[PDB]
């Protein structure tokens, strides 16, 4: 069904058209907090801001602002936090958010440097013996171990609230092979990656929402949540063919602007849902 639609769209060369339809129909809500002068250095891209209604609020007495959005997919029964790649001055805020929201997993869809350009701060420790302390938010972060595979890495991180000395194990799922240009030829690796995250238990309702990010937290990140949600709906719905990817994406864009940044990413999402459903 979705296969047929895909084939027709591919044949017609109309991905760019469908995508522009989505941009035109997308929700528009205020982002007043994100745009306050005092928050200028908390935003990686001035063009990418969380809506006020869905933004994640930090709990400590300071400025509560982080560029992150709660995407709550009611029918699919899953929530995600989408956020930008942390900046050098917001790494403490990032881990404060993970703590306060009770996240079990963090999903990273970029390399820290791509095409020789910085897309994200080095917000986790690369070496066991060199832990990170975030003094502003009073958190400690230690690399316990990592499982480096050919197309992704999973790291076992220990996050300690230095105030209470409570510790939590955070799983860091790092997809390291997203192409420098465009999207993956095949969704196979991306899909295997998604299934790994699912198998880990990180997406379970017993935990706080998974934190998903790329550089701006809308493009590859959008692809990840969109595919996951659509596959959920297909599995749950009485009539699995009734899942409309464009409608699902518009629903998600009620919670964060700009999800899926290109027609190629839209096409890739279709591809991934189709292939994933077969599995």
Does 133 interact with Cl ion (rule: CB under 5 A)?
no
Among 17, 36, 144, 162, contact with Cl ion (rule: CB under 5 A)? 36
Among 29, 121, 246, 258, contact with Cl ion (rule: CB under 5 A)? 258
Region binding Cl ion by CB under 5 A among candidate stretches 48-56, 87-95, 102-110, 124-132:
102-110
Does 198 interact with Cl ion (rule: CB under 5 A)?
yes
Nearer to Cl ion, 159 or 212 (CB): 212
Determine the Cα–Cα distance for residues 114 and 130; give it in Å rounded to an integer. Answer: 24
Spot the catalytic one: 31, 214, 225, 230: 214
Region binding Cl ion by CB under 5 A among candidate stretches 22-30, 62-70, 131-139, 157-165:
22-30
Among 9, 33, 112, 188, contact with Cl ion (rule: CB under 5 A)? 112
Region binding Cl ion by CB under 5 A among candidate stretches 49-57, 63-71, 106-114, 264-272:
106-114
CB of 180 to Cl ion, least distance (A): 4
CB 104, CB 208: distance < 8 Å:
yes
Contacts of 231-238 spanning 24+ positions with Cβ under 8 A: 231/194, 231/273, 231/276, 231/277, 232/73, 232/76, 232/77, 232/78, 233/75, 233/76, 234/273, 234/277, 236/76, 236/77
Determine the Cα–Cα distance for residues 12 and 62; give it in Å rounded to an integer. Answer: 53
Determine the Cα–Cα distance for residues 187 and 193; give it in Å rounded to an integer. Answer: 10
Nearer to Cl ion, 145 or 167 (CB): 145
Does 240 interact with Cl ion (rule: CB under 5 A)?
no
Does 18 interact with Cl ion (rule: CB under 5 A)?
no
Nearer to Cl ion, 240 or 258 (CB): 258
Determine the Cα–Cα distance for residues 192 and 23; give it in Å rounded to an integer. Answer: 29
CB of 99 to Cl ion, least distance (A): 23
Region binding Cl ion by CB under 5 A among candidate stretches 47-55, 94-102, 124-132, 194-202:
194-202
Q: Tell me: is residue 216 an annotated ligand-binding position.
A: yes
Does 116 interact with Cl ion (rule: CB under 5 A)?
no
Residue 12 CB contacts under 8 Å (≥ 6 apart), including other chains: none
Does 264 interact with Cl ion (rule: CB under 5 A)?
no
CA 82 to chain centre: 4
Contacts of 18-26 spanning 24+ positions with Cβ under 8 A: 18/246, 18/263, 18/266, 19/260, 19/262, 19/263, 19/266, 21/246, 22/246, 22/249, 22/250, 22/253, 22/260, 22/266, 25/250, 26/250, 26/253, 26/257, 26/258
Q: Reduce the DSSP state of residue 167 to 3 states and report it.
A: strand
Among 23, 32, 236, 237, contact with Cl ion (rule: CB under 5 A)? 23
Per-position x/- string for 148-187, each x denoting binding to Cl ion as judged by CB under 5 A, each - no binding: -------------------------------xx-------
Q: Reduce the DSSP state of residue 93 to 3 states and report it.
A: helix
Task: Tell me whether residue 214 is one of the annotated catalytic residues.
Answer: yes
Enzyme catalytic residues: 214
Binding residues for Cl ion (CB under 5 A):
23, 36-38, 110-112, 179-180, 198, 214-215, 243-244, 247, 258
């Amino acid at each position: 069904e979705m296969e047929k639609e895909f084939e027709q769209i591919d044949k017609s060369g109309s991905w760019a058209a469908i995508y522009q339809d989505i941009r035109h129909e997308a929700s528009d809500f205020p982002c007043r907090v994100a745009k306050l002068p005092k928050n200028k250095n908390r935003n990686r891209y001035r063009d990418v801001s969380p809506f006020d209604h869905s933004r994640i609020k930090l709990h400590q007495e300071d400025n509560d602002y982080i560029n992150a959005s709660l995407i709550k997919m009611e029918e699919a029964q899953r929530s995600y936090i989408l956020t930008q790649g942390p900046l050098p001055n917001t790494c403490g805020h990032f881990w404060e958010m993970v703590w306060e929201q009770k996240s079990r997993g963090v999903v990273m869809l970029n390399r820290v440097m791509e095409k020789g350009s910085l897309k994200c701060a080095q917000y986790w420790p690369q070496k066991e013996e060199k832990e990170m302390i975030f003094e502003d938010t009073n958190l400690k972060l230690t690399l316990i171990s990592e499982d480096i595979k050919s197309y992704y890495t999973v790291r076992q991180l220990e996050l300690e609230n230095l105030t209470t000395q409570e510790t939590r194990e955070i799983l860091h799922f790092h997809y390291t092979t997203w192409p420098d240009f465009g999207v993956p030829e095949s969704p196979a690796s991306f899909l295997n990656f998604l299934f790994k995250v699912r198998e880990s238990g990180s997406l379970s309702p017993e935990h706080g929402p998974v934190v998903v990010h790329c550089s701006a937290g809308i493009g590859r990140s959008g692809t990840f949540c969109l595919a996951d949600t659509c596959l959920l709906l297909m599995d749950k719905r009485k009539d699995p063919s009734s899942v409309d990817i464009k409608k699902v994406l518009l629903e998600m864009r009620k919670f964060r602007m700009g999800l899926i940044q290109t027609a190629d990413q839209l096409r890739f999402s279709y591809l991934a849902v189709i292939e994933g459903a077969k599995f």
